[PDB]
Write an enzyme that holds these catalytic residues in place. Structure first.
Site, PDB file in Angstrom:
ATOM      1  N   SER A 142       0.823  -1.246   0.000  1.00 32.90           N
ATOM      2  CA  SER A 142       0.000   0.000   0.000  1.00 32.90           C
ATOM      3  C   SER A 142       0.842   1.274   0.000  1.00 32.90           C
ATOM      4  O   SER A 142       0.243   2.326  -0.238  1.00 32.90           O
ATOM      5  CB  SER A 142      -1.006   0.044   1.098  1.00 32.90           C
ATOM      6  OG  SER A 142      -1.923  -1.041   0.949  1.00 32.90           O
ATOM      7  N   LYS A 183       0.462   3.396  -3.102  1.00 28.53           N
ATOM      8  CA  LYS A 183      -0.651   4.368  -3.268  1.00 28.53           C
ATOM      9  C   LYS A 183      -0.066   5.765  -3.439  1.00 28.53           C
ATOM     10  O   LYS A 183      -0.719   6.597  -4.060  1.00 28.53           O
ATOM     11  CB  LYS A 183      -1.683   4.201  -2.149  1.00 28.53           C
ATOM     12  CG  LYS A 183      -2.412   2.869  -2.271  1.00 28.53           C
ATOM     13  CD  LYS A 183      -3.506   2.601  -1.264  1.00 28.53           C
ATOM     14  CE  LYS A 183      -4.226   1.287  -1.518  1.00 28.53           C
ATOM     15  NZ  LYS A 183      -3.295   0.195  -1.918  1.00 28.53           N
ATOM     16  N   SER A 188      -6.490   3.055   2.896  1.00 25.59           N
ATOM     17  CA  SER A 188      -5.727   2.160   2.006  1.00 25.59           C
ATOM     18  C   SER A 188      -6.695   1.308   1.145  1.00 25.59           C
ATOM     19  O   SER A 188      -6.583   0.048   1.106  1.00 25.59           O
ATOM     20  CB  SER A 188      -4.857   1.340   2.926  1.00 25.59           C
ATOM     21  OG  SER A 188      -3.669   1.086   2.317  1.00 25.59           O
ATOM     22  N   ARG A 213       4.506  -0.787  13.368  1.00 31.96           N
ATOM     23  CA  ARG A 213       5.118  -0.002  12.261  1.00 31.96           C
ATOM     24  C   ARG A 213       5.320   1.429  12.775  1.00 31.96           C
ATOM     25  O   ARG A 213       6.461   1.931  12.751  1.00 31.96           O
ATOM     26  CB  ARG A 213       4.259  -0.075  11.002  1.00 31.96           C
ATOM     27  CG  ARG A 213       4.045  -1.484  10.480  1.00 31.96           C
ATOM     28  CD  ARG A 213       2.991  -1.574   9.437  1.00 31.96           C
ATOM     29  NE  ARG A 213       1.662  -1.185   9.860  1.00 31.96           N
ATOM     30  CZ  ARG A 213       0.616  -1.084   9.053  1.00 31.96           C
ATOM     31  NH1 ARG A 213       0.716  -1.396   7.780  1.00 31.96           N
ATOM     32  NH2 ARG A 213      -0.552  -0.699   9.530  1.00 31.96           N
TER      33      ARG A 213
HETATM   34  C1  LIG Z   1      -1.668  -2.391   1.505  1.00 33.18           C
HETATM   35  O1  LIG Z   1      -0.601  -2.411   2.111  1.00 33.18           O
HETATM   36  N1  LIG Z   1      -2.716  -3.214   1.686  1.00 33.18           N
HETATM   37  C2  LIG Z   1      -4.114  -2.760   1.752  1.00 33.18           C
HETATM   38  C3  LIG Z   1      -4.706  -3.003   3.163  1.00 33.18           C
HETATM   39  N2  LIG Z   1      -4.175  -2.113   4.260  1.00 33.18           N
HETATM   40  O2  LIG Z   1      -2.989  -1.430   4.041  1.00 33.18           O
HETATM   41  S1  LIG Z   1      -2.279  -0.605   5.168  1.00 33.18           S
HETATM   42  O3  LIG Z   1      -1.165  -1.271   5.845  1.00 33.18           O
HETATM   43  O4  LIG Z   1      -3.260  -0.320   6.259  1.00 33.18           O
HETATM   44  O5  LIG Z   1      -1.848   0.692   4.607  1.00 33.18           O
HETATM   45  C4  LIG Z   1      -4.542  -4.510   3.508  1.00 33.18           C
HETATM   46  C5  LIG Z   1      -3.102  -4.978   3.306  1.00 33.18           C
HETATM   47  C6  LIG Z   1      -2.534  -4.655   1.921  1.00 33.18           C
HETATM   48  F1  LIG Z   1      -3.120  -5.440   0.958  1.00 33.18           F
END
Ligand SMILES: *C(=O)N1C[C@H](NOS(=O)(=O)O)CC[C@H]1F
Ligand SMILES: *C(=O)N1C[C@H](NOS(=O)(=O)O)CC[C@H]1F
Ligand SMILES: [Cl-]
Lengths: 243, 242
Positions: free
Chosen positions: B47, B50, B95, B227
């Protein structure tokens, strides 16, 4: 109703032996709320809340190139320690640095300042007095509801200045952000001309809505300055806008 | 240029974790990490992708602005915050993969590939589906490569409009108060080992900017809070935040 008076909010002022107004505007519903409809429409000197339009004009005219440009300390040491140093647009807003904004106003000059405030439909649009002090002791007057009209235009990039100037000032207005809300706002304290008042104007960004706010309160002494934000937040909490 | 501070390993050790934090002091042009080797290992961006996706979609007019509404398709997915309408601000905050999959499709492989080259982004390899390559495709990026990319974004030096860069930096807003502003993006690479968590961004101070990029082993979703928590332990140790 389009405007709703909620006198129950007066408790947040009286609990602190204070008097003033909070105005809220629900952008999705196009509905306003206040504790005092008359005071919501009373015009006061904007004091440091004028750093919003001043920043916008300075940016749109190229007086300020960007939020990184450094404004050198003038060497004159002043009451507030944070003022006795170099600044950029972000720190000048954060620490409400008077001398920097006096220089912007001089470089904008009388004629461009008056035209821009007319273009913004800003308050009574009257800049009578010293070009580098009229927002603290000149003829300009703006009400809480007029502050909201102006802020809604800024929020929507609808002021008659570039989109870029509008985005830079909204960045510079950033006060607080967490996973629940973002506040973009500016404090003021009108200290030269009676009545002495505090201001806090801006907005709360939620996931699916924006709540504009403009508050002023009587401020006889600097003792009550924290109540500008605290009374506003008590009302936002009462209305379930922030946790 | 790069200084290894193994004393930071204690912040991973203390949480029974393994990972890397990379900090970059913009004013001094000096970098710090607990682990030079892992700082230069490339992982799936997940993510964190993004950020460049948002930039490209704004620059091409696939996204008009941060207010444009992306309608929920009415399909319940596992993350409750996804099952509703979004704009660019909330799509990044939560996300929201389906929104970004649609952006990637409208951008197309050819424009995606050229723009990641222009950004000098990771290995600039988009092998796999146009709408999943950042989770199970060819694209990989190291913590140090994230910092290089973020520093360009911070300075408006990426090869996209200034406007696009300002809008994405607005969308990255995570936390602000009287001491600091954090602009950042989380990720979680769940499909291919090693399963890792990301947090990449910067800390704006009055007089400086500290860029950061962290990844850590994330065998289960239990540890995701680490994190930010471990990153903040390092920022507090280095006197960057109180
Ligand atoms: C991206 O990293 N994604 C989408 C979603 N949540 O991401 S995040 O860590 O909260 O930014 C689920 C995991 C992955 F597919
Ligand atoms: C503006 O209203 N100013 C500048 C300074 N502080 O402003 S603020 O309320 O802290 O933002 C002193 C009061 C007045 F002159
Ligand atoms: Cl912002």
């Amino acid at each position: 109703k389009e405007w709703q008076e909620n006198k129950s909010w007066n408790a947040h002022f009286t609990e602190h032996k204070s008097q003033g107004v909070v105005v809220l505007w629900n952008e999705n519903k196009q509905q306003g709320f206040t504790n005092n409809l008359k005071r919501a429409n009373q015009a006061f000197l904007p004091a440091s809340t004028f750093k919003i339009p001043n920043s916008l004009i300075a940016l749109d005219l190229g007086v300020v190139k960007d939020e990184h440009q450094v404004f050198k300390w003038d060497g004159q040491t002043r009451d507030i320690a944070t003022w006795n140093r170099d600044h950029n647009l972000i720190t000048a807003m954060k620490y409400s640095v008077v001398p920097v904004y006096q220089e912007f106003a001089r470089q904008i000059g009388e004629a461009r300042m008056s035209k821009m405030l007319h273009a913004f439909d800003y308050g009574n649009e009257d800049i009578s007095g010293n070009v580098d002090s009229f927002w603290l002791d000149g003829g300009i007057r703006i009400s809480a509801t007029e502050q909201i009209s102006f802020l809604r235009k800024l929020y929507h990039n609808k002021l008659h200045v570039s989109e870029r100037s509008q985005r830079i000032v909204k960045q510079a207005m950033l006060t607080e952000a967490n996973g629940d809300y973002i506040i973009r706002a500016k404090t003021g304290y009108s200290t030269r001309i009676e009545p002495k008042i505090g201001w806090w104007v801006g907005w709360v960004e939620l996931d699916d809505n924006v709540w504009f706010f403009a508050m002023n309160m009587d401020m006889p002494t600097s003792d009550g300055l924290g109540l500008r934000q605290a009374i506003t937040k008590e009302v936002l909490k009462q209305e379930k806008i922030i946790p």
